[model samples]
Target: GSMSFIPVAEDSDFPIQNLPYGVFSTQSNPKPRIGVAIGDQILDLSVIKHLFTGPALSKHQHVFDETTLNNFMGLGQAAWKEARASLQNLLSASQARLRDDKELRQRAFTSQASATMHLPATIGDYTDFYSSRQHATNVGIMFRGKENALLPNWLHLPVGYHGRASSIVVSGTPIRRPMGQMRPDNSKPPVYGACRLLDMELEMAFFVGPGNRFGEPIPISKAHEHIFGMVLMNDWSARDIQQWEYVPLGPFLGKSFGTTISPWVVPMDALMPFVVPNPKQDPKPLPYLCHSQPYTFDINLSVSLKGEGMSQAATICRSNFKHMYWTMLQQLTHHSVNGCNLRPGDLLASGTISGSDPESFGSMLELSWKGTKAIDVGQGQTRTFLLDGDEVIITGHCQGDGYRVGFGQCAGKVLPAL
Candidate 1:
């Protein structure tokens, strides 16, 4: 819907309509700085820091000069909106500010291939939510049986657990296979070794913006204002370790090892156009979590597997963000319902997303039906669980008239244990 003088390539995720923010560094500029993905290039916001002349951003332009998005994200919705507007105008086809500045452009743009991407935000805390009804049900049926597929209270609120933020890595980082205790054979004594069952959970996560006070809870109506953006995430799971440790409490070393996220953070301003109706919530939520506006997004997501020997990665799972029964707003609202404060740069992820279709199952545990079946991964290969050399790739996007708002691939290869 929008055109820019900085021409984007065909099938490019970084169109003018979707200038997703990121932190990148180039060989020449070893220092990381705030930037935005646009075509095959990264527009260094640090170079154009003075251009944010809008009322909300004029005085706060230093936020764009920061190495990370934490400061900018903490400015809240109005400032975020103003920044987008200023960026759109500066990059528009009719705009001469950046388009005509040939000398200035040389210092401001870096080819996507030559630049290295870093985590967009400095995550202070991370929370993972079991928000997908199909995924949760599939997990429940396999472990808890069909009779009690959904645990009680699941319908009432979004179930979640705090996660280790320190282990969260940016895309392209290699993930070392975790080593820990597991009981492969419950009939015998527990043993310790490298994880035998490594899997990836396809997920989408949002970064939190300005936060409320310790005792103040942000209502559902105000939740959207605090959400910075969405990114593709692969929450790598150690199944064997989880099987032994997740009882009484949920996920420990099984989940603490590595969680990879995509480079770009596609802002809510670009994704709002793709918003669809919220999936029907049978029992109405409480007043604090109730809001009428649609929060569900039609983001097409896929999971691909590339073993060490394959010619190329093969797509194994296809799903959507809208498949999640609980919206990000609900999760955010429920997260702080107990007065638990959420701060800027706090990362919150939707648990594996799955649809009603079998091909849409989001994880190996479900695609293989808990390892009972083998999933074909192309090139005459099949996998039930990740092997040491296997790499998991996750990509997602929201399509529009001629362009897309995409979260570039979140990928990590499994390395042999130390």
Candidate 2:
């Protein structure tokens, strides 16, 4: 059970135990197909669909033939578990069906270098939640006073906003700087211009698998069943624009410009070994938001920035998913407490995840203290906000005894505004 037929390194992200699902395409075949990440290659699900002959998946093997994972995800946990078991068994050292068959292996395995990764699912709707206490408090203290950092309803509910699902892109995509209205001075009126305070938010998002009906609500206990997996996310922001526009209403253009995500979807079952206790909630949540088990994972997250001419990217923030004050289960439960219907492939993101220390702050707004402090990259260059050609990369992983479970990378470069 510890060894794989595929040669996986001790530090490799994709090991026999961690079989994250993704969609990929080779140069020869432009059409993307469902695949699972292993050692240094991807196992094509389309070519090996017949191997998933378990009781739950034998009749539903056609779901793996699709380009996106929406159909497969909608099959629910039973099918997901069956598929995982099948993959694990096939890749095990004892399984000769795939390891010994040279011709079938050639047809099924594709090198990671020769393939292009795409979004794992067709995200229908997106919602971002401000679940990090440190991030919220840092922003609140900068805008409001330190005494009144948190809003009145902050502890009572998970604050979130609907996002633009159409603009979501896979890693390595280019994000153009957004042009919007902003007020430079408090006394002066707002003017239209390119964003001056561009920033990147380091966070993780969960994909919905089975959804609730229009009039049905998902209780906190059943929230985990609806979640499929997690992905690294970079919620690009225009701080100056957001400062002016986000008043009575929530974020709009400043947030909707562009968001990038990692290609791999690390399933919850794969991360079960890395599970950690959730942060204790002081004011006990209502029955709708309470759960008996700890649902949080101890995944380490970080962000790096590379300037236009910089030779090396500098890591700015180092945080963990355990710092989140609100768990994803509570967030999902609160989202559907009003009988709102959630569809498969819907993305629910955790906003900037910051810890208690300054180095753990997730966004430039807090890391640089609103331009008061400058971050030093290499070559003696300093940055308060992102520049035109700046590249922002986000990566996360959970360290096991010898191996690791990682979300490859969520990277994007900024382009000049039109």
Candidate 3:
């Protein structure tokens, strides 16, 4: 592996090898611009836009100068690979173009702490998939029973629902507890008030780069070409409202309240080293969902909660991306199997990623088992569900030989409903 001229911590997520893309703005420049995270700094792509003179990017250099990454992403994987290679070459210890040029280095890099990270892409559409066997089964058993834990069509396809893209905010944004109608007592009529059962769902999502036409599906083998990268997601939930509204249809207002995603988007290429064999799918999937190669990633994931009175956050759940029953390829393929055209910047999220063990559960609903159990969140605080001012943080990372590739954080603090 090639080292970078810049200094980075051994455990730093944004090493030269993993220059994750993101949008950022600083106090001096209020306009958002494209940048890549490197160590404790951000390399402004706009400043080095002219450096991408490779055959693949020479004519499309404008993409890097843009405020968002949609145009760059739409250039497909070929351009993405070229950009990564170009960046790597420029930052390599053997290279002196950026390393030796003091003026250029000063202009091109900014302290990560001083910059405010923004959503990397302007998401046009959002979809959430329930691909975790453990998460789905636990929810099923709670609503139904063990015998009917797994739904009939669950094994047949990846269960998913369209989500509200408008409400999706970047990490660090506060989430207001939603007010919705909830029939607390079965015999009583529904009542409207601030949500009582607020929760956080730990998940990861991919951004679509190039898209397919309507009525044409992206093949399973070619799914990676259209997938740009992944990000950590905190799908905030109003459990009480969801239970009442999800009876006939799928999630609606209960889910539309808010969603938080990490600002930096970790490229799929950087995660190749962490790729592992996909979980075995029993009953076999349809031909469209089958792939000869392993697509699952072994990224370690965890969730923590910091109550208003707590001095520090407590780890509530631990899990892995490899536990997903359905691969991202399968989810993307199934999403477009019905002629649904996917556009660049569309987000496809993995539903709660839960593992087999109790500690690996991804949601308060699962951790508390429908309010039957209380989760000790440290400092003598016990929670069946989230309370006001509770901050939930989700993070994930892939360990490399001597370094790690990580998503900084996907976090949100619950506020009282208006």
Q: Model 3: runs farther than 4 Å from truth?
A: none
Whole-model Cα lDDT of every candidate shown, in order: 0.91, 0.92, 0.93
Give candidate 3's root-mean-square deviation (CA, Å).
Answer: 0.8
Clashes of each: 0, 0, 0
- The 10-residue segment of model 3 with minimum total lDDT is 1-10
Q: Please give the distance, in angstroms, between residue 167's alpha carbon in candidate 3 and its true position after superposition.
A: 0.6
| Per-residue lDDT of candidate 2, residues 70-172 (tens digit) | 9988989999998998899899999999999999999999999999999999999999999999999999999888999999889989999999999999999
* Residue 197, candidate 3: C-alpha displacement in angstroms: 0.5
- Model 2 CA deviation exceeding 4 Å by range: none
Give the total clashing residue pairs for model 1.
Answer: 0
Worst 10 residues of 1 by lDDT: 1-10
TM-score of 2: 0.98
Tens-place lDDT digits, model 3, residues 309-356: 899999999999999999999999999998899999999999999999
lDDT of 2 at 76: 95
